[PDB]
Every structure is written in C-alpha cells, then in structure tokens.
Amino acid sequence: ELSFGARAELPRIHPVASKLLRLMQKKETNLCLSADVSLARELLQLADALGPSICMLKTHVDILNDFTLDVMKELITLAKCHEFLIFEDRKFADIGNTVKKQYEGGIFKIASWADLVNAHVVPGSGVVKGLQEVGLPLHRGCLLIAEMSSTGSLATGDYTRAAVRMAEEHSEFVVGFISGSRVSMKPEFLHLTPGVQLEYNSPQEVIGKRGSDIIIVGRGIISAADRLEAAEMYRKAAWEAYLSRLG
Amino acid sequence: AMELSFGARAELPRIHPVASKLLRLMQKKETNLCLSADVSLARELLQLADALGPSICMLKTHVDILNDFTLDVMKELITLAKCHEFLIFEDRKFADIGNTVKKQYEGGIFKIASWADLVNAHVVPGSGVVKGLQEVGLPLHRGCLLIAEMSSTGSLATGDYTRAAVRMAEEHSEFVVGFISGSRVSMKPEFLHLTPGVQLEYNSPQEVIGKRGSDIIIVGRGIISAADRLEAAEMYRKAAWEAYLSRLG
C-alpha cells in the first residue's frame, strides 16, 4: 500500500485527487468535516476554526437559509488559506441538460466553487456524462456513491461493481467513491466513508480494517461543545489508522 | 380487476388527498399530460404555465435550474396553478436521509415544501429518504412519487429494485401517492403512474398510456422546443386522453 503522498504522484492521478492527496500528507489529515448547518456565519466559523484539521469540507448549500454567492467566495478564501477542498454533497441523479444546469447554473452555481461533487449511479452513466460536460472544462472532480449503509439500501454487489466500472470509464472526471470500504484496487481512486463515530463504525475500522482513505464526520464534531478538540480527536484517530496500514 | 376512471379512482376509500385532487381535475379537464417546464428563466416558466395551464394536469419544475428564482416567482406559479387547476411537481429526485433531506425539502432558499404539491425521490438509499421527507410532507399535506423504473442507458433499477420501490410506497401510503415509471408497477388503483420519455415521433402516448397502463405522460422538449407550444401541448393532451379512454372498457 502506497502513501497519500506517493499516490498524488501517480501517472494516471486526476489533478484534483493529487491536490487533495498532497494536502492530506502535508497536514496529516484524512478527515472530511460534514458542515451540516443552516446559517452562513456558522459554516464559515467552522471552516476557519477547523480548516487546519481537515482535508475537505462537505457542504449542503441547499440547506443554507442565507446562501449567496459571496458566502461561497469567503469559503473559498478559507479553503485556500487553510488548504482543504470543498465537496458539495448534492448527490446528483438526473441526466442530460438538466443535470448540467443543476451543476453549472441556477442560483447555486455549484461548479463555480465546489472542487468536488457526488453522484448516484442508478440512472446509468448519463449522470456523470452530463456533469462532465460542465466539470471537465472547469477542472473539477466527481465521486460516485458505490455503497450505502442505510437501512434498506439497495446498492447490491452488481450495483457496486457497476459504480466502479463507471468511474474507471470516466477517470478524467471521476476521482473516487463514497463507500463503506475499499471498492476499487486502483490507488488513483479515493474512498470516502460516512457514518463514522468514535463511540456507524469507528475511524479505526473504516480506515484500518476496511481500507478507506477519508472519514466523513458531522454530528460527532458539530454537536460537540468544543469542535476543534473533537475535530482533532477524529483527525488523530483516522491518521493513525492510515499510518498503521501502510508498512 | 376493473379499469376505473380517473374520477372514480379519486373516490377510492384509501386515496391520498393530493392524488384525489389530481384525479378530479384530470377528469374535469380531460388532460393527463404533465408539462416538463425545463426553462432557466422565471418569465418563460410563468408564461408557459399560464398559456398551457388549461391543457395540463401537472407542471413539472426544476427550481434549481432557475437563474432568477425567488419565492415570489413560486407565489406567482401557485396563482396560475390555482386558476388553471394543475398541480406543481418539483422533480428534485431527493436521495439523502434524516435531517438533511428534511431541510432540503422544507428549508434553504427554495423552501420546496411551501409550494410543491408533489416531489419525487430515489429509493436506492432505503426508506430513510421517504421517512425524512414525510416528517415535513405529512404535516404540510403533500405527496411523493418514488422513481421505480428508469429507461436511461445503463439504468440499474432491476426487477428487485422496482419491487422494493413498490413495497416502500405501500408501506408509506399516507405520503407516497405513486411512481415515476415506464409502465404499471402496482395493481393498486390508488397509486398514480407518471411516465417520462414521451414523444409523438422514447415511446408514444399510445404505447405509454394505452398499452403500458401508465396514467400520466411527462413531456418536455416535444412541447417546449416547438414553435406553437399550445398546439403541441394540445396534440399531446388529445393523444394521452384518447389512449386513456381506449383502455377503460
């Protein structure tokens, strides 16, 4: 198994993945914060305070009651200052011109500020092909939702295998997966895993035993009194899990 | 069973109020056409809703492609919807769960639940998506459509996926009023079936409504890209309605 830093130098690595992997190595963080807040002040305050501890800030811009593009400009400044990527967890699922406009256009103009977005694969590769039309020109990346832990989840084996093929077939845009474990043996792909809690699975299980790269964590940090301490606890846990599996 | 009329179906014991309202106006107006209003400007959305409203039972929106969205725009659409008698279906294809999906439906800038009679959802995450939506949607007297089938190339809605969608709808019948599908997926007449991918020249209204047993055609560019949108709308309405009358017996 190769280090984040070496993976960033792989021949076939996507530029956004490379950028992500470098900063994870520099900062010793594979923690993605899920910033599930409804006010812009809260979002930016968290971004600024926890920025040093994270590789990535995951947003839902569509729950921001006071969204404006200027709010996103300020978030970008923090992302640049503190060195993290912005991932809008929009879970795109439409196709064709609809999905291109949902990514590029409307009020949110997600593509203008989101380094990464994600997509569901169930509609077939039209979802990624449509996002691509926007995303390639704008030098972005995409994550495919390959597995799901939620009760009744219908991502079968075939479903998951099909996610992985679609990513491979679209490697110029798709940079990895949202998943419960390693789903692809190609080190150019990132694996991001939600449902992580210290007390759900633990960072040790997700990164150590299941082979994922990045933990996504929301309530475990956000609902805590001291968010920085919490973020740091999660960072140290996931990073050690990572160092432990390298050799 | 027997093939009941839209108007009679609206009187079924177990019919959802929104589905009843929909079926009544479908019968009253002789339309089972849903316009897909895939436009990026509020003025064109409202112009089309006003002009075509008499010919449609439903207007399907993507609020998130509207470059000049405001809630006042949606207030204006509601007035048109009331005047001409059609429902508003935001095709948001919800897929998150828990408090996220609740806030995506109730909150943010769009406040979808405040104006959308109907929304839809993907079932792939499990029943969490519906359960999350229904915490908002039930109090606000709304309905939901589950995406049970897809014709798009490489779609992964297997038989099992489709049966699971039907199951989920039956287990959440206080909120779920029907399906997005290419064909009939449930034999319960309380459930609506809406079918996209329809054009006269894809499948025709005759095939979708007449042979495959779907209730409503969803039509976008076949109307929107035409010179005379009203004529096209009327063309699709007459095709879908006649296909429906032809299957009743």
From Swiss-Prot, chain A:
Residue numbers binding UMP: 34, 36, 58-60, 94, 98, 149, 218-219
Catalytic activity: orotidine 5'-phosphate + diphosphate = orotate + 5-phospho-alpha-D-ribose 1-diphosphate; orotidine 5'-phosphate + H(+) = UMP + CO2
Keywords: Acetylation, Decarboxylase, Disease variant, Glycosyltransferase, Lyase, Multifunctional enzyme, Phosphoprotein, Pyrimidine biosynthesis, Transferase
Gene Ontology terms describing biological process: 'de novo' pyrimidine nucleobase biosynthetic process; 'de novo' UMP biosynthetic process; pyrimidine nucleobase biosynthetic process; UDP biosynthetic process; UMP biosynthetic process
Domain of life: Eukaryota
One of the record's GO cellular component terms: nucleus
Signal peptide location: none
Known EC number: 2.4.2.10, 4.1.1.23
Pathway involvement of the protein, from the record: Pyrimidine metabolism; UMP biosynthesis via de novo pathway; UMP from orotate: step 1/2; Pyrimidine metabolism; UMP biosynthesis via de novo pathway; UMP from orotate: step 2/2
Active site: residue positions: 89 (for ompdecase activity), 91 (for ompdecase activity), 94 (for ompdecase activity)
Region annotation (OMPdecase) ranges: 1-247
Binding site for orotidine 5'-phosphate: 34, 58, 91, 94, 98, 149, 218-219
Disease: Orotic aciduria 1: A disorder of pyrimidine metabolism resulting in megaloblastic anemia and orotic acid crystalluria that is frequently associated with some degree of physical and intellectual disability. A minority of cases have additional features, particularly congenital malformations and immune deficiencies.
Described purpose of this protein according to its UniProt entry: Bifunctional enzyme catalyzing the last two steps of de novo pyrimidine biosynthesis, orotate phosphoribosyltransferase (OPRT), which converts orotate to orotidine-5'-monophosphate (OMP), and orotidine-5'-monophosphate decarboxylase (ODC), the terminal enzymatic reaction that decarboxylates OMP to uridine monophosphate (UMP).
Protein name: Uridine 5'-monophosphate synthase
Coverage span on the entire protein: 224 to 479 of 480
